[PDB]
Structure 1
């Protein structure tokens, strides 16, 4: 709604800065072979798209960023702070 933000991913770790107003980084390790980028530049501006091969070795960490999110002593429904896991989906490709 208001908070302009930034996020980051540095090779093997993930950063989360100015989350809800928290001006520090929120790290999280990712295993060897799960490569990911952003589309913050312009067209999407929001999404984090996880790719990979294994059912539960990329689902295991596409579960904690939604655990790294909650706003606790606060009404939750009236406003939606968080870059949270979106739309469990089986994306295939023929492009």
Structure 2
């Protein structure tokens, strides 16, 4: 089996061993793609994922790889967008971005500020009651995006009642 990826005109693919770096006018995403007997490579403008094997396990990763690169294309061109809306009921929650780590204060009336660190280049930007995580690396973005929603995780009290927390609203 063998699949090919014609990289878009904005994009610049490049490989070194197992690692593949993708460049666009939005950013650059380097990613390692490693699996038994699946070989990825650049042929001028196309990316070639090929393997002499054709077993479901081998095919599973072939498929996975493609999307990882295709996403990298979109990442370095248009980028990834995750939208969030901070929500609070009785306690006025404060969500800001201190340095390189989105922070949340006075959650459920806490004196202790909860804070996660930002994954990679990902850009967390607040606009009142909305937050927008973006970037070329869906991996870092999708994670940082999730990181925020998770940070307001509660388990000792009924969530159906206690819902204060920043939530993801838009997935790219």
The answer for the alignment partner of 2:21 in structure 1 is: none
Q: TM-score, normalised by structure 2?
A: 0.44
Q: How has the CA–CA distance of structure 1 residues 66 and 36 changed in structure 2, closer, same or farther, with 3 Å as cutoff?
A: closer
- Unaligned ranges ≥5, structure 1: 41-45, 91-95
Normalized per residue, the structure richer in helix is 2
The answer for the alignment partner of 2:125 in structure 1 is: 37
SS at structure 2 position matched to 1:59: helix
- Unaligned ranges ≥5, structure 2: 1-88
Question: Aligned partners of 2:149, 2:93: CA distance in 1, in Å?
Answer: 17
The answer for the alignment partner of 1:19 in structure 2 is: 107
Q: Deviations over 1:46-95 (max 9, x none)?
A: 1111111122121122122222122222222134211122232x2xxxxx
Question: Aligned partners of 1:63, 1:4: CA distance in 2, in Å?
Answer: 22
Q: How does 1:78-93 map to 2 (within 5 A)?
A: 78-88=161-171, 90=172
Quote how far apart the aligned CAs of 1:11 are.
2.6
The answer for the alignment partner of 1:93 in structure 2 is: none
Normalized per residue, the structure richer in strand is 2
Larger relative contact order (Cα-Cα within 8 Å, sequence gap ≥ 6): 2
Q: TM-score, normalised by structure 1?
A: 0.73
Larger radius of gyration: 2
Quote how far apart the aligned CAs of 1:16 are.
0.9
Question: Aligned partners of 1:3, 1:16: CA distance in 2, in Å?
Answer: 12
The answer for the alignment partner of 1:72 in structure 2 is: 155
Question: Aligned partners of 1:22, 1:63: CA distance in 2, in Å?
Answer: 22
C-alpha RMSD of matched pairs (Å): 1.8
Quote how far apart the aligned CAs of 1:19 are.
0.8
Aligned residues: 84
